């Protein structure tokens, strides 16, 4: 976090003055203010040189404060740009090393060289060992150890990279410290998400969002009507008496023109992009974020997106003649030798339910049996009768071979487990079956609260599974989604996306693997994860460095924040002008129309003081609204008819009332300073 | 008399809503492709005879049809008025008009502005005001209703690029909305005291023996469409103060109801066509609140009236100068607000002889753009531009993309909305500057001080905003005034019809979207207040410096 540091604010204040000559006319509001500044400066020069009469000091002060208005708008823009560049240079270049490990054989018998990574390109195997930098992005086809992606992601806790299948992804700018791995080069360094981010932040000019274009069109219309209302007022007063001076006209024009949002649209956009960058999300365009700030439907998986684990013990169901304590004791005896996470879940749930903590392992007189998938069963030889746990069909076959039959109560509770949506695991003590343990797939990710937050926001959290509908509905009720999907095929996924898109709403999804890369391509908001594949990251829209499925909530929050900020600043600058009428209109025409002198309801000192106070307030409101533009407005999940009430009651009422206080206080300071 | 004024406003709005709901249903039926009941057999043979069928044309050809009809009407009316000497029905042997006056009144009567710088007693013959002026009062109104029909069809149509048929729309409107109500209004005017004849000017030997010439003519047939189509512009010089043209307070009340009949019926038709009537009641509340405070302020200002009257020696302070005696101060104030908010332009009280505060509010109502029951369909789209602006700023408020009735608002409609908004303040603020720099426009004053500039601003704003009501002291019969006001009327009509039609052509392509329980409720007191605030703020941020040197300076003098 950067709390506006003096190391960078001055370094961008020197670059503020570079934005004066020809970097202004891309912003029409600030270019009209710049042209007015130059015109009044020329008038003040010719007016102090004796060519034109009057109070040249007042015109010089007006010219100076208009120039300071332009410098303040450029200062807000340069502050946003400098903060974004500081974030980009903090992310970029944690370590730049040209150590290649150029070789040909993926095994641990290969050679090395010192080729730069700019030359090492297009799918080259890179063997990296512990304590060495991973050069570029790619996948880990062999290896699997604890990588250190803190310098890129921003985390602190170590992450374990699992080679093959799930975590077949690596980045450029990370550290490996446990064992030796191999890295594929895959896509070229320079076309990665980090390089695209620094390309659009530093150097190349970012493109305007269509919402920013529409707001700019509205601001151009407002400055056109204000120009036509402020000019063509010299002919209105020429008949009325003495003509009004051009300096007062330009001061009134700059006061009327929406400078507050006109000089801060770029600051708002760059601050939104920097808040993306500080939330571990890389967006290649602001249009993606502002489209994410509109979506009503969320599409997220459940294999690692919600259910962070396999099917694990949640409940115990004893049917007839077997107590739960003895059932849990026999299950603990059977699952003492089971290093699977489901076995650990069974152990911790049994100890939670019956305080089965201390076991005399030495006096067991048993032989530990590991989990063997050939017989798909596991257990221990605790007694003369042997206890084994595995799949229900293999258990039934082994019981029938031993000389026992399938029991009715055991079968009906297995069927109840099947309809409730759990994997049935049965404990069998010799020829007598004790009970069946229900193992539902466990969420244990804390996503119910975030889904409640989404329902408070009003986003259709559609959830998709690959198994049957009963299991999907059973886990959907606990997870807290409104919609559940079953039997996930990619054709069905893309059909659902097309159904949602053709209905009218905008879609959003968070896919990580390469299987839903066409879904990410035909998805408006494609939040690819850091742990996801490089192909999915390069085919999607956004890259999530933190690999958190709940990051789209923050993405929608910031995307709504930037539109809310620009709309609120727009209504502030539009409602802001009634005070400039009540301060300047009785003051501009005091020497020509003394009848309308009674309009200054703030009771200002002099007409010169009133015009100067209005111009000074217009200059200072930009600086006083820089922090709100940089941080964004306060987002609260409210009704669509209540957030408008809150935004109006704050910002429109501020536009009516705050400039009265500002102009009166600035005029009071000018009076007590002896200037007027 | 505050209770009497409030009760008059209440009964006017009540009778207006009662008489506008079934006309709203009929106009919604006409907006949809279904015809009116009991008229299909004549409809098919009439369209077979006229060759107007199987033309579901887009915004380009619809706008080209409307523009071509109005240009053809402009040429016919201009040549008829230029050569009215050879044409029949010349009882007074009135000569042909000059080029400047003829062009000014031709553009005036084809752009639905109806500015009249002449006197109809002694300037135009009977055939002129009966066969060119009446037909353009019908045709400009039908063009406005056809354009708003195209816009409402664009809002209610899903994905096709075809709006409708302009010739069919004009024919149904003119033959089954304008004319069959125009007969009832004209026959009521005859039944109450207005005249309709073709006699020569009757000479009167009065009681004192002084000779007096009475101008006869087809007055009520013109007056019916002049009020119903929000047209304005009288047969005589006094547009609706004339006892031959508005004889009784009953006729005046019928005139007010006719002025607001079609805008209110079009809001009701918009609510019925879009599916939910709350989206029309939103617009009606938004216009009616502004109308109620405007007429209250004007009524109070005219009740206060001239402060010099008691000092001069009278008994009452009410500004009854330039107001008829058959109509009260309250009735004259209500008619002024009605004819100036609706852009009708016919007056029962001379607006130039008003108090400064009571004459600012009609002038300001024209300044904001004729959106408070404005126009005849030409004020519904004027309000719809501010509605699109309000839904844009409210979408930016909520953080969503802008939306109105499901359809999305982006830069394509935003450019056109901005242009259509700023066409008329541009025309007002350059015409009021060009008239006040040229000596030939500065010498057309009648009152000294700021009221002369107020007269010029009122005249150029009524020209640019298609109102036609005048501060009548401005001697605007000069060639410069005629040409400048003709340019203002022409551009302020056909530089608002064109971008509204381009908005309609852009909006008809994109598909509507359901409510989805998270969108901004367009119907409601919050949005009514936001829309009213948007209209008043936009109209009073570009014109307070202009109004401060006129009516505000005169009032504070």
């Amino acid at each position: 976090a950067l709390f506006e540091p003096t190391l960078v604010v001055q370094a961008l204040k020197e670059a503020v003055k570079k934005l004066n000559p020809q970097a202004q006319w891309r912003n029409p509001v600030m270019f009209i203010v710049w042209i007015g500044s130059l015109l009044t400066t020329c008038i003040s020069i010719a007016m102090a040189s004796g060519a034109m009469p009057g109070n040249a000091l007042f015109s010089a002060a007006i010219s100076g404060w208009l120039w300071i208005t332009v410098l303040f708008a450029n200062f807000a823009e340069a502050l946003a740009e400098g903060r974004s560049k500081a974030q980009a240079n903090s992310l970029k270049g944690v370590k730049k090393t040209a150590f290649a490990r150029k070789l040909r054989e993926p095994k641990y018998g290969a050679a090395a060289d010192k080729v730069p990574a700019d030359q090492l390109r297009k799918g080259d195997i890179v063997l990296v060992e512990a304590g060495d930098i991973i050069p570029c992005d790619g996948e880990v086809i062999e290896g699997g150890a604890s990588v250190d992606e803190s310098a890129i992601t921003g985390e602190s806790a170590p992450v374990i990279r699992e080679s093959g299948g799930d975590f077949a992804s690596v980045t450029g700018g990370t550290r490996i410290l446990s064992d030796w791995l191999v890295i594929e080069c895959s896509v070229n360094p320079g076309e990665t998400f980090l390089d695209r981010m620094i390309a659009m932040v530093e150097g190349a000019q970012r493109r305007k969002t269509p919402n920013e274009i529409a707001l700019t069109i509205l601001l151009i219309a407002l400055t056109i009507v204000f120009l036509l209302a402020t000019a063509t007022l010299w002919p209105f007063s020429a008949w009325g008496g003495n003509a009004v001076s051009v300096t007062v006209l330009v001061a009134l024009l700059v006061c009327l023109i929406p400078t507050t949002i006109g000089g801060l649209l770029s600051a708002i956009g760059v601050a939104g992009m920097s808040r993306m960058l500080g939330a571990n999300v890389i967006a290649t365009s602001g249009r993606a974020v502002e489209a994410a700030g509109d979506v009503d439907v969320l599409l997220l998986n459940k294999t690692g997106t919600i259910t962070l684990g396999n099917r694990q013990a949640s409940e115990f169901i004893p049917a007839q003649g077997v107590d739960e304590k003895t059932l849990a004791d026999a299950a603990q005896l059977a699952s003492l030798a089971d290093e699977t996470p489901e076995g650990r879940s069974i152990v911790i749930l049994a100890k939670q339910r019956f305080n089965l903590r201390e076991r005399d392992v030495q006096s067991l007189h048993a032989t530990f049996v590991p989990f063997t998938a050939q017989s798909r069963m596991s257990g221990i030889n605790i007694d003369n009768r042997m206890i084994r746990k595995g799949s229900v069909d293999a258990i039934r076959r082994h019981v029938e071979a031993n000389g026992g039959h399938f029991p009715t109560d055991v079968d009906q509770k297995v069927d109840q487990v099947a309809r409730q949506g759990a994997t049935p695991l049965v404990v069998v003590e010799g020829s007598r079956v004790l009970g069946v343990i229900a193992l539902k797939d466990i969420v244990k990710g804390g996503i119910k609260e975030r889904f409640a937050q989404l329902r408070k926001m009003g986003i259709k959290t559609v959830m998709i599974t690959g198994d049957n509908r009963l299991t999907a509905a059973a886990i959907a009720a606990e997870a807290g989604v409104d919609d559940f999907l079953a039997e996930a095929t990619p054709e069905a996924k893309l059909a659902l996306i097309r159904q949602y898109q053709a209905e009218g709403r905008l879609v959003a999804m968070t896919g990580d693997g390469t299987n839903d890369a066409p879904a990410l391509a035909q998805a408006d908001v494609a939040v690819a994860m850091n742990s996801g594949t490089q192909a999915a990251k390069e085919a999607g829209n956004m890259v999530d460095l933190d690999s958190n499925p709940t990051k789209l909530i923050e993405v929608v929050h910031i995307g709504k924040q930037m539109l809310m900020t620009r709309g609120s600043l727009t209504t502030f600058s539009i409602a802001n002008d009634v005070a400039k009428y009540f301060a300047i209109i009785p003051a501009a025409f005091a020497a020509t129309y003394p009848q309308l002198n009674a309009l200054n309801i703030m009771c200002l000192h002099s007409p010169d003081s009133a015009i100067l106070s209005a111009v000074i307030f217009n200059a200072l409101i930009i600086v006083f609204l820089i922090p709100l533009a940089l941080k964004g407005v306060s987002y609260k999940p409210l009704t669509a008819s209540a957030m408008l009430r809150r935004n109006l009651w704050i910002y429109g009422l501020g536009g009516l009332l705050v400039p009265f206080i500002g102009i009166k206080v600035i005029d009071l300071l000018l009076t007590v300073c002896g200037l007027v | 008399m505050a209770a009497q004024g409030f009760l008059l406003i209440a009964t006017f709005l009540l009778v207006l809503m009662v008489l506008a709901r079934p006309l709203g249903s009929g106009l919604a039926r006409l907006i949809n492709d279904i015809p009116l009941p009991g008229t299909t057999g004549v409809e098919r043979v009439l369209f077979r005879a006229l060759g107007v069928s199987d033309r579901e044309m887009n915004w380009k050809q619809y706008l080209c049809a409307i523009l071509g009809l109005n240009m053809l009407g402009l040429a016919v009316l201009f040549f008829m008025l230029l050569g009215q000497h050879y044409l029949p029905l010349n009882p007074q042997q009135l000569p042909g008009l000059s080029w400047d006056l003829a062009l000014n009144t031709a553009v005036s009567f084809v752009t639905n502005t109806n500015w009249q710088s002449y006197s109809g007693e002694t300037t135009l013959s009977y055939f002129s005001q009966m066969a060119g002026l009446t037909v353009q009062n019908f045709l400009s109104a039908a063009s406005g209703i056809a354009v708003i029909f195209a816009l409402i069809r664009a809002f209610t149509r899903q994905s096709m690029s075809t709006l409708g048929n302009a010739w069919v729309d004009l024919l149904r409107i003119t033959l089954w909305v304008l004319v069959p109500v125009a007969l009832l209004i004209a026959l009521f005017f005859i039944q109450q005291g207005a005249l309709q004849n073709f006699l020569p000017y009757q000479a009167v030997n009065t009681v004192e023996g002084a000779q007096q010439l009475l101008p006869m003519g087809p007055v009520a047939s013109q007056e019916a469409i002049k009020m119903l189509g929000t047209n304005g512009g009288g047969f005589f010089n006094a547009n609706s103060s004339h006892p031959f043209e508005n004889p009784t307070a009953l006729t005046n009340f019928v005139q007010m109801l006719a002025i607001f009949l079609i805008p209110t019926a079009l809001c009701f038709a918009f609510g019925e066509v879009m599916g939910d009537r709350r989206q029309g009641r939103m617009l009606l509340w938004a216009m009616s609140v502004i109308f109620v405070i405007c007429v209250g302020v004007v009524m109070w200002a005219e009740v206060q009236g001239n402060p010099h009257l008691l000092a001069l020696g009278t008994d009452s302070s009410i500004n009854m100068e330039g107001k008829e005696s058959r109509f009260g101060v309250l009735v004259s104030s209500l008619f002024a607000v009605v004819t100036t908010a609706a852009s009708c332009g016919a007056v029962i009280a001379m607006h130039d002889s008003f108090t400064a505060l009571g004459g600012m509010v009609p002038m300001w109502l024209m300044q904001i753009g004729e959106v408070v029951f404005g126009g005849v369909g030409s004020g519904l789209y004027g309000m719809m531009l501010f509605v699109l602006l309000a839904v844009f700023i409210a979408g930016l408020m909520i953080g969503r993309t802008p939306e109105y009735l499901g359809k999305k608002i982006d830069v394509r409609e935003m450019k056109l909305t901005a242009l259509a908004i700023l066409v008329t303040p541009t025309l007002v603020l350059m015409g009021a500057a060009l008239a006040m720099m040229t000596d030939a426009g500065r010498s057309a004053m009648l009152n000294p001080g700021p009221h002369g500039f107020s007269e010029v601003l009122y005249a150029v704003s009524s020209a640019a905003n298609n109102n036609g009501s005048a501060f009548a002291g401005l001697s605007a019969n000069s060639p410069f005034w005629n040409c400048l006001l003709a340019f203002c009327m022409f551009v302020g009509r056909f530089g608002v019809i064109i971008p509204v039609m381009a908005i309609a052509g852009s909006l008809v392509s994109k598909k509507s979207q359901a409510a989805s329980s998270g969108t901004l409720p367009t119907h409601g007191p919050l949005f009514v207040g936001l829309l009213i605030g948007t209209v008043l703020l936009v109209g009073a941020l570009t014109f307070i410096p202009a109004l401060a040197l006129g009516p505000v300076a005169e009032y504070l003098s």
């Binding site: 029409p28 009209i32 274009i213 151009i220 056109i224 000019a231 063509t232 010299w234 | 450019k415 242009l419």
Partner: peptide, 27 residues
């Protein structure tokens, strides 16, 4: 001969043309 308004009107029309060109364009 009319300095002080003959340049003011030209500058106002120039600024209006620039601003309406900015409204037309998507710079």
């Amino acid at each position: 001969m009319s300095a002080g308004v003959i340049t003011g009107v030209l500058l106002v029309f120039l600024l209006l043309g620039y601003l309406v060109y900015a409204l037309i364009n998507a710079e």
